[PDB]
Amino acid sequence: PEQRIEKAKGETAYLPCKFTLSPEDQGPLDIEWLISPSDNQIVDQVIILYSGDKIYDNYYPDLKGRVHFTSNDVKSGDASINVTNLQLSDIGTYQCKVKKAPGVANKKFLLTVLVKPSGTRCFVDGSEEIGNDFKLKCEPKEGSLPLQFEWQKLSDSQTMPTPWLAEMTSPVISVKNASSEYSGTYSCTVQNRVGSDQCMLRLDVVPPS
Amino acid sequence: PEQRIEKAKGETAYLPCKFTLSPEDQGPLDIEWLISPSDNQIVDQVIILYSGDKIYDNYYPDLKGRVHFTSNDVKSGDASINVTNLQLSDIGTYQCKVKKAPGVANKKFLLTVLVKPSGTRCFVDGSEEIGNDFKLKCEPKEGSLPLQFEWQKLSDSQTMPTPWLAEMTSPVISVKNASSEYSGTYSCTVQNRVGSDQCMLRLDVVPPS
């Protein structure tokens, strides 16, 4: 089991890792967390240890100061960690390895970090001319999937061209055989569960010449 | 670094894992060996531990009784193991993980187990007729690469047909436009660095009818 944990950038991830001891488990309690980041191909890197009743946490410089055991009494049965001020670079697989010999247990977490849509650009791809085919595009610079789009007409009738109604919730509107009546100011609003962004374009459909 | 170790079936593998302690390493000495076998897709399975100055070795039933720490004073700086009576099924990646907090070190071994050639079959693939094309094949049932082959003629002239001289060290001899003179008893001897096998065939090249 690889449990998915999903949080937004800047929030804190809780990676729970509670454990029961068998009375047979007489060896010293030893706990190791390791990361395998997405951003690169290093694998199984120690980020924090509990060993000899002491915490060692100076391991992985990208996580400096941001990884802590959740509990104030780890030896009672809680190996959970907090990862605070989440960065996009913290996306990866986190493994909790608990040992109290002969007992050994592991668990993995797949951490994803979400970001709201931002830097969203609204633009026309093509010549804005009567009879032409061109494209209305709403392109976020950043934004975690799944993303929702919604075009609206801000100017004049405040009503989207009927032929475009099917692509109204799409990032791209593929305009065919353009009418001058399609002209106007249009808004693209993009959202995901973190947040929202909006942009605007002006369409001016003129005779081709 | 993934150090290759190669031994023959029934021999003992030595997987060295000596370590130096830094005087800063004050946590308890903790050693873990894990296997990731080729034969299946289980990964990172504990085969033996040194924890709290005690050995725990009842982990991986295929290795029962066959994994031991090499040294009688492991804590002095020797995490090496012996794997005795090697089976083909022991082929895999072995990892030694040494910890004495804050110090942590790992090393991997890629274990391969060699077997001599055996069950070698010598046979003609095709009709043994004047004018025909057919094949002399020497097929071991088992045998670790790299393998060497050598055909010889045992009968009559004790000399291989001149046209076959180029395929004399090949497991397959591709006979073209067969002469009756090609007839005879031929030996195929196959070897690798572990051992040897030999087989024999009788070629009787007769008129096609």
Curated annotation (Swiss-Prot), chains A, B:
Disulfide bonds: 17-96, 122-199, 138-188
Every Ig-like C2-type domain range: 1-112, 117-204
Nucleus among keywords: no
Keywords: Cell adhesion, Cell junction, Cell membrane, Disulfide bond, Glycoprotein, Immunoglobulin domain, Lipoprotein, Membrane, Palmitate, Phosphoprotein, Receptor, Repeat, Secreted, Signal, Tight junction, Transmembrane, Transmembrane helix
Entry-listed glycosylation sites: 82
Tissue: Expressed in liver, kidney, heart, lung, and brain. In skeletal muscle is found at the neuromuscular junction. In cardiac muscle, isoform 1 and isoform 2 are found at intercalated disks.
GO biological process, one term: AV node cell to bundle of His cell communication
GO molecular function, one term: cell adhesion molecule binding
Example of a GO cellular component annotation carried by this entry: acrosomal vesicle
Keyword Nucleotidyltransferase annotated: no
Extracellular topology ranges: 1-209
Note on domains (UniProt): The Ig-like C2-type 1 domain mediates homodimerization and interaction with JAML. The PDZ-binding motif mediates interaction with MPDZ and MAGI1.
Subunit structure of this chain's protein: Monomer. May form homodimer. Interacts with LNX, MAGI1, DLG4, PRKCABP, TJP1 and CTNNB1. Interacts with MPDZ; recruits MPDZ to intercellular contact sites. Interacts with JAML (homodimeric form).
Function: Component of the epithelial apical junction complex that may function as a homophilic cell adhesion molecule and is essential for tight junction integrity. Also involved in transepithelial migration of leukocytes through adhesive interactions with JAML a transmembrane protein of the plasma membrane of leukocytes. The interaction between both receptors also mediates the activation of gamma-delta T-cells, a subpopulation of T-cells residing in epithelia and involved in tissue homeostasis and repair.
Protein name per Swiss-Prot or TrEMBL: Coxsackievirus and adenovirus receptor homolog
Top-level taxonomy: Eukaryota, Metazoa, Chordata, Craniata, Vertebrata
